[PDB]
Amino acid sequence: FDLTVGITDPEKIGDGMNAYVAYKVTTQTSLPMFRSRQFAVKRRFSDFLGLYEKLSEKHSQNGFIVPPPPEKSLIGMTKVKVGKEDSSSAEFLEKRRAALERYLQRIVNHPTMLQDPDVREFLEKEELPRAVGTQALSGAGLLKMFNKATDAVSKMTIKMNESDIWFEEKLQEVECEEQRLRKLHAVVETLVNHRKELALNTALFAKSLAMLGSSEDNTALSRALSQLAEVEEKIEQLHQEQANNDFFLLAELLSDYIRLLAIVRAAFDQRMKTWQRWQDAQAT
Amino acid sequence: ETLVNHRKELALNTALFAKSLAMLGSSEDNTALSRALSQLAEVEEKIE
Amino acid sequence: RKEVTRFEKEKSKDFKNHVMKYLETLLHSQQQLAKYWEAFLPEAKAIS
Amino acid sequence: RKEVTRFEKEKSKDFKNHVMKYLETLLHSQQQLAKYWEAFLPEAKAIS
């Protein structure tokens, strides 16, 4: 495919907890809206997720389409229940790279909306914002929580339409789907916890083989120790690498899928708000 | 004997994984995925 | 609704991600597993 | 002390019980495992 990129070098921006890591991002993209076939941008995250939220309010006002999350930081010790940094140190940065690859693919998926060239030049250049990206100003969501009371009394007059008669089957369907995937998410991460004491238990079994194979001269048993401990460690690393990486990736997949579900809930909530805007407009 | 206790919730966890495969393989028409369900559940039970 | 068709296309895509997951699972499981089977049975002719 | 020699002989015997344990372990693991490998790869040529 025409999108050929490369993201390397998790370069830190000093000392702290969950703030900023620079990314060496080399982009060799075709399709000459990309400028010159050879760019290598250095981009720091937790700065263009604010650009993504400008994109969020932008497609709120004009009904456009945004791509998967450019996941930010302030997540290891806050807002997540919980996150670990030694597992993050390169690997959750690779999960950022996966979410960014899905970002790239679906930002190519809206090609006319990809030709909003300001944000494309924002991505393929370096003009990086400063480190003030940790604050709380979600008063817009507070006003949404205020207007939820008007939503709860107007929702029937919303429901008298016909497009939602095409739509609400997907609503109830995705409700039972989100219930059964949040339950399967929890039991999957329970297995991710389970495998760790599995691996420690079988590793200490191999160590106890090495222990109790002492004080004996049945040297075939000694070769059995020396072969069994290492093949146990092969099985250990095998189901260990499967048991983490694909399970927690499918978990991130369903998680930002739930995020996409929540923002499309908010999308037809904005459609609802503009509905009652023209409704009381024509009434008055 | 701690491993003998461990394997029981291992087996229940992976059996409920195969059951959740059978669950979430509904509401979709990608019938290769349906054959994947019908083959994966039983080979998981073989490993179990 | 065109975006709805687009994210059923990514339903196909991430179901395909689980499909290629079990594809590489069967692949690397079979090749690595049976590789040390066929590399450790000829030493287990009679050497433990 | 002759009984001591006798129960080092049963040390050899129950160590041999673990030896025949891993003997049947490698045996049934390899034959059953690789049996459904060679029985489920020809259906996984392209059928899931």
DSSP codes joined into one string, D1-48: -HHHHHHHHHHHHHHHHHHHHHHHHHHHHHHHHHHHHHHHTTTSSS--
Residue C9: Cβ-neighbour burial (10 angstroms; 0-12, 13-18, 19+)? exposed
Tokens of C24: 């590489």
What span, in angstroms and rounded, lies between the C-alpha atoms of A203 and A133? Answer: 44
Q: Which residues of D touch B33 (CB under 8 A)?
A: 48
DSSP state for residue B31 in the 8-state scheme: T
3-state SS string over chain C? Answer: CHHHHHHHHHHHHHHHHHHHHHHHHHHHHHHHHHHHHHHHCCCCCCCC
A64, A7, A250, B34 alpha-carbon torsion, rounded to 10°: 80
Q: What is the least distance, in Å, from the CA of A176 to any CA of chain B?
A: 11
Structural biology method used: cryo-EM
What span, in angstroms and rounded, lies between the C-alpha atoms of B44 and B10? Answer: 12
What span, in angstroms and rounded, lies between the C-alpha atoms of A70 and A52? Answer: 8
Tokens of C26: 């069967």
Q: Which long-range contacts (CB under 8 A, 24 or more apart) does A101-107 make?
A: A101/A5, A102/A67, A102/A68, A103/A67, A103/A68, A103/A69, A103/A70, A104/A3, A104/A5, A104/A67, A105/A3, A105/A67, A106/A65, A106/A67, A106/A68, A106/C10, A107/A67
CA atoms within 13 A on the CB side of A145: 5
∠ CA(A213), CA(A215), CA(A219), 5° rounding?
55
Strand order of the sheet with strand A5-12? Answer: A5-12, A21-27, A39-44
Yes or no, beta carbons of D48 and B43 under 8 Å apart: no
Query: Residue A24 in contact with residue A7, Cβ under 8 Å?
Result: yes
**What does the buried/exposed string (b/e) look like for D11-42 if buried means 16 or more CB atoms within 10 Å of the residue's CB?**
eeeebeeeeeeeeeebeeebeebeeebeebee
Query: Residue C40 in contact with residue A227, Cβ under 8 Å?
Result: yes
CA-based end-to-end distance of chain A: 54
Query: Helix or strand or coil: residue B15?
Result: helix
Yes or no, beta carbons of A231 and C40 under 8 Å apart: yes
Neighbouring subunits of A (3+ Cβ pairs under 8 A): B, C, D
- Which residues lie across from A42 on neighbouring strands? A24
Q: Is B32 on the interface with D (CB under 8 A)?
A: yes
**What does the buried/exposed string (b/e) look like for B16-40 if buried means 16 or more CB atoms within 10 Å of the residue's CB?**
ebbebbebbbeeeeeeebeebbebb
Tokens of A67: 């791509």
Yes or no, beta carbons of D19 and A216 under 8 Å apart: no
3-state SS string over chain A? Answer: CCCCEEEEEEEECCCCCCCCEEEEEEECCCCCCCCCCCEEEEEECCCCHHHHHHHHHHHHHHCCCCCCCCCCCCCCCCCCCCCCCCCHHHHHHHHHHHHHHHHHHHHHHCHHHHCCHHHHHHHCCCCCCCCCCCCCCCHHHHHHHHHHHHHHHHHHHHHCCCHHHHHHHHHHHHHHHHHHHHHHHHHHHHHHHHHHHHHHHHHHHHHHHHHHCCCCCCCHHHHHHHHHHHHHHHHHHHHHHHHHHHHHHHHHHHHHHHHHHHHHHHHHHHHHHHHHHHHHHHHC
Please list, in sequence order, all residues whose beta carbon lies within 8 angstroms of the beta carbon of residue A126, skipping any fewer than 6 positions away.
Answer: A41, A42, A43
Closest CB from D11, D12, D22 relative to A224: D22
What span, in angstroms and rounded, lies between the C-alpha atoms of B7 and C29? Answer: 21
CA of D34: which chain C residue's CA is closest? C34
Yes or no, beta carbons of D15 and A216 under 8 Å apart: yes
Tokens of D36: 């459904």
What span, in angstroms and rounded, lies between the C-alpha atoms of C40 and C45? Answer: 9
- H/E stretch holding B12 reads helix B2-24
Residue A108: asked if its preceding bond is cis (omega within 30°), the reply is no
Pairing of strands A5-12, A21-27: antiparallel
CA of C25: which chain A residue's CA is closest? A242
Query: Residue B18 in contact with residue B44, Cβ under 8 Å?
Result: yes
Query: Residue A232 in contact with residue A205, Cβ under 8 Å?
Result: yes
Query: Residue A95 in contact with residue A71, Cβ under 8 Å?
Result: yes
∠ CA(C31), CA(C37), CA(C39), 5° rounding?
95
What interhelical angle do D2-40 and A220-283 show, nearest 10?
Answer: 40
Closest to C46 measured CA to CA, from A276, B28, A219: A219
